[PDB]
Amino acid sequence: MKVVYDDVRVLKDIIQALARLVDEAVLKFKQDSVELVALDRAHISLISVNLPREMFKEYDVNDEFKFGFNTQYLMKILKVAKRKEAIEIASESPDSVIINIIGSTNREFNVRNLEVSEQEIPEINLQFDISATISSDGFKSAISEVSTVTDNVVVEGHEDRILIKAEGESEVEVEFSKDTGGLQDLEFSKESKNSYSAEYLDDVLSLTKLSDYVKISFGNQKPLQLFFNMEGGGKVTYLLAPK
């Protein structure tokens, strides 16, 4: 089970939505791709990553791979490479996986598979009312801005605007209506009115920036979902319980 990945930024940022959301996940290198869906203990949020065989220098598999990890430990052992350094992940025995960081010093580590168990997640199969598209850097800035003093944010958009409003002290709102710079896409079924809280719902910060095209999936009496698309067919889908 030898795999080689050219980039480390993909392996230094994708886990930011995973580092503090659920402390346990199942890195599932498939027989034909790599796909990651793992539940969360809060039973509120859930992230997924889709990655086919397009960004791996070498990818040889024979059986299912379930390298366990600790989120904090995984981040720690992926903080050495800075510029472009590649990685070399393989082993021979299912007791420890040799994680070799290509470049500079010949460096490989031995990490125990802290095996954990979790339930399966269905393939959404749910439709929503709005799938908008804004500036990801701008939308991240809005999530960081409208929720800086408050502890709750209300999402409301009637026909041609999106307002993730947070009230209680001052009704400060940011809109992306028509083609004024925001709302690059919009599907409509009904007027929108919902809320999404602060704190660890603000802790999806450094994940969107990989692709500068956000796509929410907010809907009435429905959980949240952030839709994305990267190069090489890499899409990451977010989940979030109401308010």
Binding site: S135, G138, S170
Partner: protein, 251 residues
């Protein structure tokens, strides 16, 4: 009911930060001659005055002189993020409160600002009419350098000016700080009239200075023999700031 646009949002953020370092609730006195504000400390040692001459505004239309009292308990942070140096900010009164808007031509991320406040009786524009002998211009990394240097080795800083020379001596006998400003050092222009010395509040010196980062233009600094210091600098898109600190004549 007025509509005045400030083409620089970061300038507005800098102004509100500069006025925040003296109190918690501020004012924005709207007159037919400009937009100006005024405040002072409880101990009368330091204060900031912000005014906007009516020549640099993109639009400027007000019927009557109006003044409003507002707090920056939340306004500071909700305006603490404006990621566009090219962002224009406009303010317009509403029926009950205060409404401010910011526009950026990068993502269409217009942000609406609401402040719960009403107009009040205005106060006549009155500035301490004094003349300062020593006058000079400098960058934004000389005042901050002096503040940060002194912030450790004492709280009593004395700025001594010689004939075309500037001397700093501060702290107590155990630990001091020695530096000089020779003609054309970290200044630019000099208008020294009389060699004089004075003193101020070093912690409040840094407190006044720290609300000044972002001023891309040189800062004009003046004081006198026990005269309240002037720290003058205007931003790129208009707006003149005048900072007052009172000389603590012995303790």
């Amino acid at each position: 009911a007025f509509k005045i646009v400030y083409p620089n949002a970061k300038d507005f953020f800098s102004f509100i930060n500069s006025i925040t370092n003296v109190t918690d609730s501020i004012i924005l006195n709207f007159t037919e001659d400009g937009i100006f504000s005024r405040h002072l400390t409880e101990d009368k040692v330091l204060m900031a005055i912000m005014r906007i001459p009516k020549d640099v505004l993109s639009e400027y239309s007000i019927d009557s002189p109006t003044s409003v009292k507002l707090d920056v308990s939340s306004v500071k942070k909700i305006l603490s993020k404006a990621s566009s140096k090219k962002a224009t900010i406009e303010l317009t009164e509403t029926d009950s409160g205060l409404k401010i808007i910011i526009r950026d031509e990068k993502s269409g991320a217009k942000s609406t600002i609401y402040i719960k406040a009403e107009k009040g009786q205005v106060e006549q524009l009155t500035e301490p009419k004094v003349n300062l002998a020593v006058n000079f211009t400098t960058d934004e990394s000389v005042l901050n350098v002096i503040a940060a240097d002194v912030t450790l080795v004492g709280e009593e800083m004395r700025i001594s000016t010689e004939e075309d020379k500037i001397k700093i001596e501060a702290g107590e006998e155990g630990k001091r700080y020695v530096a000089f400003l020779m003609k054309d050092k970290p200044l630019k222009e000099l208008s020294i009239d009389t060699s004089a010395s004075s003193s101020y509040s070093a912690e409040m010196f840094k407190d006044a200075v720290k609300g000044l980062r972002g001023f891309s233009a040189p800062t004009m600094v003046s004081f006198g023999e026990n005269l309240p210091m002037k720290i003058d600098v205007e931003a790129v898109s208009g707006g003149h700031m005048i900072f007052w600190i009172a000389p603590r004549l012995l303790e």
